[PDB]
């Protein structure tokens, strides 16, 4: 299994720190957390090709203009609990992807995942910081706590909209994955469409119990996703 | 530079999961945070000592008696911004310890570190779920936010206590430690303490500007950590 995974960086001190993931939609469009974004710091995208778990090739290093950097007009980083965390970031060129990799699918508008749905994270489990891409990946099962599930008063409770998604606080912890880091699952014709991408976890951490990752549901976010990429 | 490293695990499903870092202050004491623990669960602890980030020899798996946990009176999970986020466990025999790392050393009661100050934290990054304990530590430098830096509006605010320690919050990211992990650092004499042991972070994780990963500040409980140890 093939895969491009993103990792988005800011450059302080005469270096670049990863950020956040996100997901490679296209060539040159990535899908993040809006609460990746300040469009005062100075972005680039770092791009490794994994087949596996495994870095194939040499990453690929992008510089961000200010201004190809599109956050939600309702994302408000005082409310993570009002949602809309949710980014685009157009790449200054396109990325050179060959064609070894299927680039994950946008869902359907309005698609909502059964309780219990296998759904994937991958990514550098916020271990890795900046410079060379780790040559390994971090990839788990994270089955989705569908909204009656995930709003009972022990689990996230009123804190969560319908334009989330919620996927584990069981015994699989969603640690494997980073901030702004997709959520994967498989289509009924079998490929992969980014169901959410990785918003707030509990105040003690990823992987606690009755506390599953907040994804920012993309499903509902298509309108305004197309016409950001078709505007740009 | 030795360590003892902690692994507090509760039993699910019929075995035993990670949950919680911890400091090995005595040969069968562990602190770490009040939030790690529940009462009705079956607990151990996984032991291992680590030298320049190496696991030393084998791990040592070392059972908790029901009725050997202690939590502050004072935690209150409905409240992590109360703070008294602290809980002391017994183990039911003594660690082997060998002679090479000295345990973690309790600060002073009421000691307060300097801004700035160069402390350390070191675990598996919440990617170790359970099993054999890693062969490999994370350990990074995270240094220390004083309270009037931490409570400032666009940091904390509001929500640190005195009785907490902040570090991070900039470039060097808190994302190595684990849930309840402490925060070690040099005293005068060069010997190493446990200042912290880790609470919350912020809602979008481990690694976010301005929201550095807050520790219940141990040298605000003493007084109830010496006394638990003296009566049991």
Redesign the interface.
């Known amino acids: 299994s093939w895969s491009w995974q993103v990792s988005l960086q800011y450059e302080?001190?005469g270096?670049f720190?990863?950020?956040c993931g996100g997901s490679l939609i296209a060539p040159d469009w990535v899908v993040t957390a809006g609460?990746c974004i300040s469009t005062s710091r100075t972005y680039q995208v770092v791009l490794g090709e994994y087949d596996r778990s495994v870095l194939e090739g040499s990453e690929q290093v992008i510089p961000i203009n200010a201004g190809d950097l599109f956050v939600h007009p309702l994302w408000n980083s005082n409310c993570?609990a009002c949602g809309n965390d949710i980014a685009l970031v157009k790449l200054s060129r396109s990325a050179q992807l060959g064609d070894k990799v299927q680039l994950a699918n946008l869902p359907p508008a309005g698609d909502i995942l059964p309780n219990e749905a296998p759904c994937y994270i991958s990514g550098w489990?916020?271990?890795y910081?900046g410079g060379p891409l780790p040559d390994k990946l971090?990839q788990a099962l994270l089955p989705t706590v569908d909204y009656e599930h995930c709003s009972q008063w022990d689990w996230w409770g009123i804190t969560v909209k319908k334009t989330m998604v919620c996927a584990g606080g069981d015994?699989?912890?969603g640690?494997?994955g980073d901030?702004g880091g997709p959520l994967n699952c498989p289509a009924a014709d079998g490929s992969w469409q980014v169901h959410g991408v990785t918003?707030?976890?509990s105040?003690?951490?990823?992987?606690?119990i009755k506390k599953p990752t907040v994804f920012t549901r993309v499903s509902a976010f298509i309108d305004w996703i197309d016409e950001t990429i078709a505007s740009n």
């Open positions: 302080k001190d270096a720190h990863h950020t609460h993570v489990g916020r271990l910081t971090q015994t699989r912890s640690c494997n901030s918003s707030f976890v105040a003690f951490g990823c992987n606690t």
